Scaffold this motif. Structure first.
Motif, mmCIF file in Angstrom:
data_model
loop_
_atom_site.group_PDB
_atom_site.id
_atom_site.type_symbol
_atom_site.label_atom_id
_atom_site.label_comp_id
_atom_site.label_asym_id
_atom_site.label_seq_id
_atom_site.Cartn_x
_atom_site.Cartn_y
_atom_site.Cartn_z
ATOM 1 N N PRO B 8 8.696 -2.976 4.993
ATOM 2 C CA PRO B 8 9.345 -2.921 6.415
ATOM 3 C C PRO B 8 9.886 -5.078 6.753
ATOM 4 O O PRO B 8 10.660 -5.163 6.967
ATOM 5 N N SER B 9 8.381 -5.954 6.398
ATOM 6 C CA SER B 9 8.501 -7.147 6.691
ATOM 7 C C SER B 9 8.825 -8.386 6.232
ATOM 8 O O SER B 9 9.132 -9.267 6.083
ATOM 9 N N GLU B 27 -4.142 -5.431 -2.088
ATOM 10 C CA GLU B 27 -4.131 -5.672 -1.095
ATOM 11 C C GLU B 27 -4.999 -7.146 -1.977
ATOM 12 O O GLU B 27 -5.758 -7.929 -0.875
ATOM 13 N N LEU B 31 -1.748 -8.282 1.022
ATOM 14 C CA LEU B 31 -1.277 -7.549 1.841
ATOM 15 C C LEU B 31 -1.733 -6.274 2.341
ATOM 16 O O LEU B 31 -3.183 -5.877 2.214
ATOM 17 N N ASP B 32 -1.444 -5.434 3.751
ATOM 18 C CA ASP B 32 -2.020 -4.352 4.294
ATOM 19 C C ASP B 32 -1.107 -2.785 3.585
ATOM 20 O O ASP B 32 -0.642 -2.330 4.647
ATOM 21 N N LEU B 33 -0.619 -1.973 2.293
ATOM 22 C CA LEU B 33 0.360 -0.766 2.917
ATOM 23 C C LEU B 33 -0.618 -0.222 2.584
ATOM 24 O O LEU B 33 -1.985 -0.160 2.655
ATOM 25 N N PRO B 34 0.480 0.872 3.040
ATOM 26 C CA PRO B 34 -0.522 1.956 3.855
ATOM 27 C C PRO B 34 -1.203 3.531 2.328
ATOM 28 O O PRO B 34 -0.092 2.991 1.663
ATOM 29 N N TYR B 35 -2.703 3.383 2.916
ATOM 30 C CA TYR B 35 -3.277 4.799 2.062
ATOM 31 C C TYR B 35 -3.462 5.715 3.509
ATOM 32 O O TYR B 35 -3.646 5.137 3.930
ATOM 33 N N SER B 36 -4.000 6.462 2.325
ATOM 34 C CA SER B 36 -5.263 7.468 2.927
ATOM 35 C C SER B 36 -5.771 7.911 2.356
ATOM 36 O O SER B 36 -7.256 7.470 1.830
ATOM 37 N N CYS B 37 -5.681 8.489 1.320
ATOM 38 C CA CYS B 37 -6.544 9.815 0.093
ATOM 39 C C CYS B 37 -7.419 8.649 -0.664
ATOM 40 O O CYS B 37 -8.722 8.100 -1.337
ATOM 41 N N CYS B 42 -2.052 12.918 -1.988
ATOM 42 C CA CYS B 42 -1.693 12.929 -0.356
ATOM 43 C C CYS B 42 -0.117 12.348 -0.672
ATOM 44 O O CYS B 42 0.210 11.735 -1.788
ATOM 45 N N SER B 44 0.634 9.150 1.129
ATOM 46 C CA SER B 44 0.515 8.230 2.155
ATOM 47 C C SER B 44 1.159 6.888 1.693
ATOM 48 O O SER B 44 1.555 6.069 2.387
ATOM 49 N N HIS B 88 6.733 2.356 1.881
ATOM 50 C CA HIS B 88 6.318 3.201 3.058
ATOM 51 C C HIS B 88 7.230 3.982 2.141
ATOM 52 O O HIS B 88 8.208 4.404 3.564
ATOM 53 N N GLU B 90 6.996 7.795 2.312
ATOM 54 C CA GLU B 90 6.554 8.945 2.816
ATOM 55 C C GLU B 90 7.556 9.997 3.442
ATOM 56 O O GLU B 90 7.552 11.242 3.101
#
Ligand code: FES
Ligand code: FES
Lengths: 94, 94
Positions: B8-9, B27, B31-37, B42, B44, B88, B90
């Motif tokens: 996005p940025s 990482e 960078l700060d990419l989205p995750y969860s599990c 999942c 994310s 991004h 999802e």
């Protein structure tokens, strides 16, 4: 408090104490909301508050303009009322 | 391999060995990419492959139709060539 999360896969309702972060409560409820730093220093967990109020004082990524518009970093946000949050709003910042 | 991430940025380019997951390389590159599990269970960390190929055999959330369309769970995906991924994505699954 009751937190209503409007997520891509549907609406979810969870209970989140006033002293628990929204992301932590979501995880305890079995949801997989996005995050990265978990320290208020990125926008990966960003959402938008549509109702209610939060306290996200430890955040440091959002500016006052963005917070003013309802953006919230869910990793460091407490509900201070029942809250409705639209999740996955990082893209909306850019 | 060279991994081009359309985030996005902005666009980011990182180097990711054939035996390293894309998210882990991102990482390491700050960078700060989205995750969860972080376990392929999942959506994310979902992205879309626009060029190149990945190996995401440990994933288990995406169906064959979705993978067929280029979706990738970046937490358990290796590049097997240079790769361009739109991050991004999802929401694009739902
Ligand atoms: S995960 Fe980085 S600000 Fe919440
Ligand atoms: S973070 Fe859950 S599948 Fe990648």
């Amino acid at each position: 408090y009751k937190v209503t999360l409007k997520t891509p896969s549907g609406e979810e309702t969870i209970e989140c104490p006033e002293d628990t972060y929204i992301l932590d409560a979501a995880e305890e409820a079995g949801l997989d909301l996005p995050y990265s730093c978990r320290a208020g220093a990125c926008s990966s967990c960003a959402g938008k508050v549509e109702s209610g109020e939060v306290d996200q004082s430890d955040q440091s990524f959002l500016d006052d303009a963005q917070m003013g518009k309802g953006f919230v970093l869910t990793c460091v946000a407490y509900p201070t009322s029942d809250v409705t949050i639209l999740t996955h709003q990082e893209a909306a910042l850019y």
